[PDB]
Amino acid sequence: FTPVVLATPIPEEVQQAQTEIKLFNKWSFEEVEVKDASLVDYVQVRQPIFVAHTAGRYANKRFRKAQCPIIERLTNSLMMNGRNNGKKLKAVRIIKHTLDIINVLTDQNPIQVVVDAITNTGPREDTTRVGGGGAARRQAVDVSPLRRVNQAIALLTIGAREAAFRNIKTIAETLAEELINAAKGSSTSYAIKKKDELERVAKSNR
């Protein structure tokens, strides 16, 4: 045996961690699993990825979108609102810097904080504008698991971009602020407020 370094050299940590474990840049794809007894196979994780860049053919089927990696689905939700359309290299970069922040404060490998922020803000029921004749009332309905995945990431990237709007604190700072206050139920973030405001109306008008 005894493999040597070749004519074209490779750094040692690149040699070390990659062949041993199918990790992230620097993050494992062993542990954290789902703590919710739902949303399975809407959670893509296992399969693992290196970076969140893939020409993913997940769009032309009703449910192949759920097989997109949720970390790359985060990057899909960032690069919008006019000034960020395109710019996928921008969004992948900020995700890396955000994962730098979260794994420092109370390490808890930071895809845990990703998974917990999705499961704990999905509105488990919702209302629609049901007609009833002229005066369009509302009726409580239990929304799909796929839209609960959809509405989870939506409230994250909207509220974090508005929080980083017209201040010193950046996108990566305010988005990490949203994830910590939503991995634990705190209602100091944008979404856990907006999750509870949707779920209190459907209880009122049931």
């Binding site: 369009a136 407020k193 405001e197």
Partner: protein, 216 residues
């Protein structure tokens, strides 16, 4: 004290919306409908309840002269009878006369905003419907109605949380049904066992709020 706008959603405050207001323009120079045209309402094919801006000027001089505005926990949003939703900056100076107020409202409706005479900020803004996007996140919404149960102001304000704001909707009209916000509010509340004007209910909820929030 900080000046409160729609951009701040966090600070606990009190917001009043003069919904269903009477803001109608008229050509002769563009003038508001009222005094000046009460003998020409039918002549223009118009309505009487569509000619009541004195209630609106009265309630603006009610709310904006309240000490909770001077304490800085109050916002005023105005919806017309046609549904025109308006953000009011609480540091604005309303003219006490009906004439300068009237030209100010014509200038507001045609110029779609009023700006500062000294700085780079909007004194008045025409905003989009719905209201709940412009409202803060945690906020109780109630509709004043004589046909709603009568409660006390101070206790029900003391039922609120430390972060939950309060907003109230007032139909700025002479008469009619109070069904303009069935699509919006959590609760219809009454203030008295007697029928009131709008500004008296405004001073009731203002002064009860200042008794509850310890504003002197």
């Amino acid at each position: 004290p900080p000046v409160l706008t729609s951009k701040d959603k966090i600070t606990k405050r009190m917001i009043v919306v003069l919904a269903m207001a009477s803001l109608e323009t008229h050509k002769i120079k563009y003038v508001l409908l009222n005094d000046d045209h009460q003998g020409l309402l039918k002549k223009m094919g118009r309505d009487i309840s569509e000619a009541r801006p004195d209630i609106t000027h009265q309630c603006l001089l009610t709310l904006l002269d309240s000490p909770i505005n001077k304490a800085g926990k109050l916002q005023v949003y105005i919806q017309t009878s046609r549904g025109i939703l308006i953000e009011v900056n609480p540091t604005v100076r309303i003219p006490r006369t009906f004439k300068r107020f009237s030209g100010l409202m014509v200038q507001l409706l045609h110029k779609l905003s009023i700006r500062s005479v000294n700085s780079e900020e909007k004194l008045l803004k025409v905003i989009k419907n719905p209201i709940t996007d412009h409202l803060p996140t945690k906020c109780r919404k109630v509709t004043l109605s004589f046909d709603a149960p009568v409660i006390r102001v101070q206790d029900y304000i003391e039922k609120l949380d430390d972060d939950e704001s309060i907003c109230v909707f007032v139909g700025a009209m002479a008469r009619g049904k109070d069904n303009f916000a069935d699509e919006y509010v959590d609760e219809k509340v009454g203030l008295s066992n007697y029928p009131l004007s709008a500004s008296v209910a405004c001073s009731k909820f203002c002064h009860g709020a200042e008794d509850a929030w310890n504003i002197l």
